[PDB]
Each structure stands twice: as C-alpha cells, then as structure tokens.
Design an enzyme around this catalytic site. Structure first.
Site, PDB file in Angstrom:
ATOM      1  N   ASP A  88       0.796  -1.344   0.089  1.00 36.34           N
ATOM      2  CA  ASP A  88       0.048  -0.057   0.329  1.00 36.34           C
ATOM      3  C   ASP A  88       1.027   0.850  -0.360  1.00 36.34           C
ATOM      4  O   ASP A  88       0.575   2.629  -0.655  1.00 36.34           O
ATOM      5  CB  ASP A  88      -0.719  -0.145   1.081  1.00 36.34           C
ATOM      6  CG  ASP A  88      -1.700  -1.196   1.125  1.00 36.34           C
ATOM      7  OD1 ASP A  88      -2.620  -1.867  -0.022  1.00 36.34           O
ATOM      8  OD2 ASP A  88      -2.596  -1.506   1.937  1.00 36.34           O
ATOM      9  N   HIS A 130      -3.862  10.149   5.234  1.00 38.02           N
ATOM     10  CA  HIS A 130      -4.567   9.138   6.367  1.00 38.02           C
ATOM     11  C   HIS A 130      -3.314   8.857   7.193  1.00 38.02           C
ATOM     12  O   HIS A 130      -2.667   7.851   7.997  1.00 38.02           O
ATOM     13  CB  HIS A 130      -4.256   7.505   5.448  1.00 38.02           C
ATOM     14  CG  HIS A 130      -5.360   7.626   4.541  1.00 38.02           C
ATOM     15  ND1 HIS A 130      -6.622   7.817   5.202  1.00 38.02           N
ATOM     16  CD2 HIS A 130      -5.846   7.482   2.966  1.00 38.02           C
ATOM     17  CE1 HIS A 130      -7.598   7.474   4.425  1.00 38.02           C
ATOM     18  NE2 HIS A 130      -7.002   7.957   3.288  1.00 38.02           N
ATOM     19  N   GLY A 138      -2.480   3.963   3.526  1.00 34.15           N
ATOM     20  CA  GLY A 138      -3.473   4.654   2.013  1.00 34.15           C
ATOM     21  C   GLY A 138      -2.369   4.850   1.449  1.00 34.15           C
ATOM     22  O   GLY A 138      -2.769   6.637   1.634  1.00 34.15           O
ATOM     23  N   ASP A 165     -12.429  14.019   0.571  1.00 36.88           N
ATOM     24  CA  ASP A 165     -11.960  12.992   0.099  1.00 36.88           C
ATOM     25  C   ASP A 165     -12.980  11.822   0.169  1.00 36.88           C
ATOM     26  O   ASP A 165     -13.278  12.074   0.878  1.00 36.88           O
ATOM     27  CB  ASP A 165     -10.291  12.802   0.497  1.00 36.88           C
ATOM     28  CG  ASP A 165      -9.662  11.559  -0.616  1.00 36.88           C
ATOM     29  OD1 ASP A 165     -10.159  10.331  -0.770  1.00 36.88           O
ATOM     30  OD2 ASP A 165      -8.816  12.097  -1.397  1.00 36.88           O
ATOM     31  N   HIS A 167     -11.815   9.049   1.199  1.00 32.66           N
ATOM     32  CA  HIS A 167     -11.582   8.224   1.810  1.00 32.66           C
ATOM     33  C   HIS A 167     -11.507   9.026   3.471  1.00 32.66           C
ATOM     34  O   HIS A 167     -12.045  10.154   3.315  1.00 32.66           O
ATOM     35  CB  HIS A 167     -10.225   7.473   2.107  1.00 32.66           C
ATOM     36  CG  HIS A 167      -9.944   7.074   0.602  1.00 32.66           C
ATOM     37  ND1 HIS A 167      -9.941   7.387  -0.122  1.00 32.66           N
ATOM     38  CD2 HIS A 167     -10.300   5.355   0.535  1.00 32.66           C
ATOM     39  CE1 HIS A 167     -10.020   6.510  -1.122  1.00 32.66           C
ATOM     40  NE2 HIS A 167     -10.098   5.200   0.076  1.00 32.66           N
ATOM     41  N   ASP A 254     -10.411  11.253  -6.068  1.00 38.52           N
ATOM     42  CA  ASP A 254     -11.059  10.243  -6.114  1.00 38.52           C
ATOM     43  C   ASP A 254     -13.047   9.840  -5.739  1.00 38.52           C
ATOM     44  O   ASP A 254     -12.994   8.580  -6.125  1.00 38.52           O
ATOM     45  CB  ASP A 254     -10.076   9.159  -5.222  1.00 38.52           C
ATOM     46  CG  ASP A 254     -10.262   9.353  -3.696  1.00 38.52           C
ATOM     47  OD1 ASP A 254     -11.139  11.103  -3.633  1.00 38.52           O
ATOM     48  OD2 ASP A 254      -9.971   8.844  -3.099  1.00 38.52           O
ATOM     49  N   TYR A 293      -7.350   9.572  -8.772  1.00 38.08           N
ATOM     50  CA  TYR A 293      -6.859   8.382 -10.061  1.00 38.08           C
ATOM     51  C   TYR A 293      -7.210   8.225 -11.709  1.00 38.08           C
ATOM     52  O   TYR A 293      -6.711   7.505 -11.838  1.00 38.08           O
ATOM     53  CB  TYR A 293      -6.790   7.076  -9.045  1.00 38.08           C
ATOM     54  CG  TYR A 293      -6.490   7.106  -7.440  1.00 38.08           C
ATOM     55  CD1 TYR A 293      -5.358   7.667  -7.437  1.00 38.08           C
ATOM     56  CD2 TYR A 293      -6.881   7.101  -6.692  1.00 38.08           C
ATOM     57  CE1 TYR A 293      -4.399   8.030  -5.683  1.00 38.08           C
ATOM     58  CE2 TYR A 293      -7.040   7.576  -5.067  1.00 38.08           C
ATOM     59  CZ  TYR A 293      -5.522   7.705  -5.001  1.00 38.08           C
ATOM     60  OH  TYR A 293      -5.417   8.090  -3.503  1.00 38.08           O
TER      61      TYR A 293
HETATM   62  O1  LIG Z   1      -7.365   7.648  -1.518  1.00 38.89           O
HETATM   63  C1  LIG Z   1      -6.596   7.228  -0.189  1.00 38.89           C
HETATM   64  C2  LIG Z   1      -5.432   6.609  -0.525  1.00 38.89           C
HETATM   65  C3  LIG Z   1      -5.524   5.828  -1.459  1.00 38.89           C
HETATM   66  C4  LIG Z   1      -5.767   3.756  -1.289  1.00 38.89           C
HETATM   67  C5  LIG Z   1      -5.649   3.664   0.118  1.00 38.89           C
HETATM   68  C6  LIG Z   1      -6.081   2.422   0.984  1.00 38.89           C
HETATM   69  C7  LIG Z   1      -6.213   1.547   0.089  1.00 38.89           C
HETATM   70  C8  LIG Z   1      -5.636   1.460  -1.217  1.00 38.89           C
HETATM   71  C9  LIG Z   1      -5.454   2.727  -2.108  1.00 38.89           C
HETATM   72  N1  LIG Z   1      -5.071   2.799  -3.751  1.00 38.89           N
HETATM   73  C10 LIG Z   1      -5.159   2.702  -4.007  1.00 38.89           C
HETATM   74  O2  LIG Z   1      -5.436   0.965  -4.339  1.00 38.89           O
HETATM   75  C11 LIG Z   1      -5.190   2.604  -6.451  1.00 38.89           C
HETATM   76  C12 LIG Z   1      -4.957   3.793  -6.328  1.00 38.89           C
HETATM   77  C13 LIG Z   1      -4.275   4.442  -7.339  1.00 38.89           C
HETATM   78  C14 LIG Z   1      -4.017   3.683  -8.353  1.00 38.89           C
HETATM   79  C15 LIG Z   1      -4.686   1.883  -8.334  1.00 38.89           C
HETATM   80  C16 LIG Z   1      -4.476   1.328  -9.529  1.00 38.89           C
HETATM   81  F1  LIG Z   1      -4.051  -0.256  -8.929  1.00 38.89           F
HETATM   82  F2  LIG Z   1      -5.344   1.086 -10.086  1.00 38.89           F
HETATM   83  F3  LIG Z   1      -3.480   1.404 -10.116  1.00 38.89           F
HETATM   84  C17 LIG Z   1      -4.326   1.755  -7.190  1.00 38.89           C
HETATM   85  N2  LIG Z   1      -6.334   8.374   0.194  1.00 38.89           N
HETATM   86  O3  LIG Z   1      -7.551   9.682   0.461  1.00 38.89           O
HETATM   87  K   LIG Z   2     -13.309  12.655   3.551  1.00 39.85           K
HETATM   88 ZN   LIG Z   3      -8.961   8.897  -1.505  1.00 43.94          ZN
END
Ligand SMILES: O=C(CCc1ccccc1NC(=O)c1cccc(C(F)(F)F)c1)NO
Ligand SMILES: [K+]
Ligand SMILES: [Zn+2]
Ligand SMILES: [K+]
Length: 364
Positions: A88, A130, A138, A165, A167, A254, A293
């Site tokens: 991650d 995070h 994250g 966001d 999340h 996102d 993303y």
């Molecule tokens: O959105 C977030 C953090 C991102 C995150 C947290 C926990 C688990 C996974 C993620 N992000 C991704 O898995 C991710 C982000 C961008 C692109 C990709 C991909 F796999 F498509 F490339 C995957 N913070 O506001």
């Molecule tokens: K939020």
């Molecule tokens: Zn996020």
C-alpha cells in the site's frame, strides 16, 4: 486578496515521481497554466520541510526510518512493516525527499496565510490525510495536512479541517481527536471492507475533543445535488457552532465520476459548490489535493476548482497543452456522471444529519 499558488518546477517533478499516480502533479499544473490561471495568482516556491518541522507531528524513529529507506530501499531492512511501509505504501527510494517537499509546501502555504499575504493558499500536490505520527498509511508517507494545521495554530486559535476526499480523513482526525482547538469534518465512503473502515457518524471525538470530530458516512453513487445538500447542511451548523478563524480544505478528487475507485458519482461543479460555501466565509483558507486516480479527471476537477477560487469561468473546450491527448475523445472540462444508482436512502441520510445537528449543539 490574490490567491497563493504553491509551485516550482522541482516541486512538481518530485510529485510526479511517486508511482501508482505518475505525472499527475505535472498534468494538473499543465492544465491550470493552459487556462492562464497562474497569471492571476501569486506563485510561491515551496520550501522543503526540516526534520524539526516534520517532527512536530511525527516521531523521530519513524522519520529516521523513512530517511534510511529513501537512501537504500527495503532490502537489508525488514523493520519496514512496523512503520506502515508495504504494498500500500511502497518503500521506494527518494520518498523522504518527497515527504519533505510535500510537508514543506503545505507549511509554506500555511505561512503565507499567517503573514497576511493571502486569504487562500493552494497546494494541489498535498492532502495526504491518512499518515499517522509513526506509520505510513493509505499511500500517505507524511501528514502534510496535520503539519499545516499546526503551523496555522500560531496565528489562529480555532481551525476547521474539511475533508472531501472519498476516504475518511482518519490520520488528521486522530491527530486532533482529543482537542477542541481543531475541528475535523469528513464526508466519505463508509462500508464494510472500504478503507480505512473508520469515521462512522458515531465517531465524535474523545475527552476535551468530544463533538469536535464530525463524520458523514455516505454510500456509493451520490451525485452533486445531494452531496451539496449534505455538505452545506453540516457546514452551516459547524460555522455557527465552532466559529473557525481559519480553514484547511482537502479536496480529494477520487470522489469524481470515472475514478478507478468507482464509488461516488460526483462532478467538479458539485464539489465547487461546497468550495464556494467555504470561500464565502472570507477566512484564511489552505487548499489541498489528495486522492485522484483518473489523472485527467483529477486535473479537470482541480483546474475547475482553481477557477472558482478566482471567480473565473472557464471554457468547455480544453486548451492545447502538453497533455492534450489525455483529454480525448471529447476534449472538454466538464465530467458526466456514470449511470449507476444512488444507494443513499433519504431517511438514513436525514437521521445522520440530525445526529450531527445534535452533536454540534454542545459546541461552546
Ligand atoms: O484514496 C486515498 C488513498 C489510496 C488507497 C488507500 C488504501 C488502499 C488503496 C489505495 N489506493 C489504490 O489502491 C490505488 C490508487 C491509484 C491507482 C491504483 C491502481 F491500482 F489502479 F493503479 C490503486 N486517500 O484518500
Ligand atoms: K473525506
Ligand atoms: Zn481517497
Ligand atoms: K478534534
């Protein structure tokens, strides 16, 4: 009265070098520049955050491990797992310099606010909400949001953090969970399995900080009209109750229609309405990016949001610039919602909103 735009070339190139999100910092700036918006803002070069500045939130043991890993890289260092590095949060080389750049930029934005250089300061490459004091999380290696709130606390007794966001803004919330001096507000997806699995509406804060955490758990497929109803409902109560002297605003993109996360069904106009509402308070306001993303859509959003900070109205047709091809096939600024259902039941939303009204009645 002109906004500050935190930017250098060296800052943007470093923010491009985090994998899982390549060349995004560049795409955002490239599009903001192509709409001539940088010409109406004050470009301020970010400083790099020092170890001491960074250590105002984070533990030295964490920062030092983060520094080591940045020179070497995960092999000959099995201690990584303890400090949140893993799949991650990759333990790749150069990240401590990224961490420092990001934290430095948010801190530089907060200092511009404190000095009275501006009412609004922007660091779209920030918003990494995070990160915990001693643990990456994250995809956040350093909590720049927290470092900026703490810098703001020199000039401003009460600070409001509003995190839009997708999340839950868990790391920022946790940092200030036991104080009434910083209120954290968060609209997020909250469903079994979904990261980070905190921030239910009943998450209200602890000790002296009870009722000074606010969380709106939202389900998939929410669109602009309904989100703004939820947002200005919560923010109207928060303004009157808390009465903030300054605002830190995480605008993770996102939540936008077309994102890999594929949860919310928002457009940047929906978020922009939430942003206008915070801007009409005329308070010191630190603007941050975060998740985002679908890289083109993220630039479309954050470019649009910059326009609204300026009160400008941008054309639908994307300007020709370095990354023009990324905006095909239509080459437009506006984003169209996906055709999926809105799983937010009105009664469930209304009982969430009334609970928050009630928790905010306690705020003195
Ligand atoms: O959105 C977030 C953090 C991102 C995150 C947290 C926990 C688990 C996974 C993620 N992000 C991704 O898995 C991710 C982000 C961008 C692109 C990709 C991909 F796999 F498509 F490339 C995957 N913070 O506001
Ligand atoms: K939020
Ligand atoms: Zn996020
Ligand atoms: K709090």
């Amino acid at each position: 009265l002109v906004p500050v735009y935190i930017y250098s070339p060296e800052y943007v190139s470093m923010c491009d070098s985090l994998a899982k999100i390549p060349k995004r910092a560049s795409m955002v700036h490239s599009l903001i520049e192509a709409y001539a918006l940088h010409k109406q803002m004050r470009i301020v070069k970010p400083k790099v955050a020092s170890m001491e500045e960074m250590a105002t939130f984070h533990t030295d043991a964490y920062l030092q491990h983060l520094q080591k890993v940045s020179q070497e890289g995960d092999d000959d260092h099995p201690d990584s797992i303890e400090y949140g590095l893993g799949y991650d949060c990759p333990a790749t080389e150069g990240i401590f310099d990224y961490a420092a750049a990001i934290g430095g930029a948010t801190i530089t934005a907060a200092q511009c606010l404190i000095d009275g250089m501006c009412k609004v300061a922007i660091n779209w490459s920030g918003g990494w909400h995070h990160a915990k004091k001693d643990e990456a999380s994250g995809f956040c290696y350093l909590n720049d949001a927290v470092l900026g709130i703490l810098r703001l606390r020199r000039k401003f007794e009460r600070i409001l953090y509003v995190d839009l966001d997708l999340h839950h803004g868990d790391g920022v919330e946790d940092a200030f969970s036991f104080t009434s001096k910083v209120m954290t507000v968060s609209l997020h997806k909250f469903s079994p399995g979904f990261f980070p699995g905190t921030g239910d509406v009943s998450d209200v804060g602890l000790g002296k900080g009870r009722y000074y955490s606010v969380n709106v758990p939202i389900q998939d497929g929410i669109q602009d009209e309904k989100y703004y109803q939820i947002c200005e409902s919560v923010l109207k109560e928060v303004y009157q109750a808390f009465n903030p002297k300054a605002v830190v605003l995480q605008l993770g993109a996102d939540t936008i229609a077309g994102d890999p996360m594929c949860s919310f069904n928002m457009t940047p106009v929906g978020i922009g309405k939430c942003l206008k509402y915070i801007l009409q308070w005329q308070l010191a306001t630190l603007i941050l990016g975060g998740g985002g993303y679908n890289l083109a859509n993220t630039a479309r959003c954050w470019t649009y949001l910059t326009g609204v900070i300026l009160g400008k109205t941008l054309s639908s047709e994307i300007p020709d610039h370095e990354f023009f091809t990324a905006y095909g096939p239509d080459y437009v600024l506006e984003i169209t919602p996906s055709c999926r259902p809105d799983r937010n039941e009105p009664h469930r939303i209304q009982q969430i909103l009334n609970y928050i009204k009630g928790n905010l009645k306690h705020v003195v």
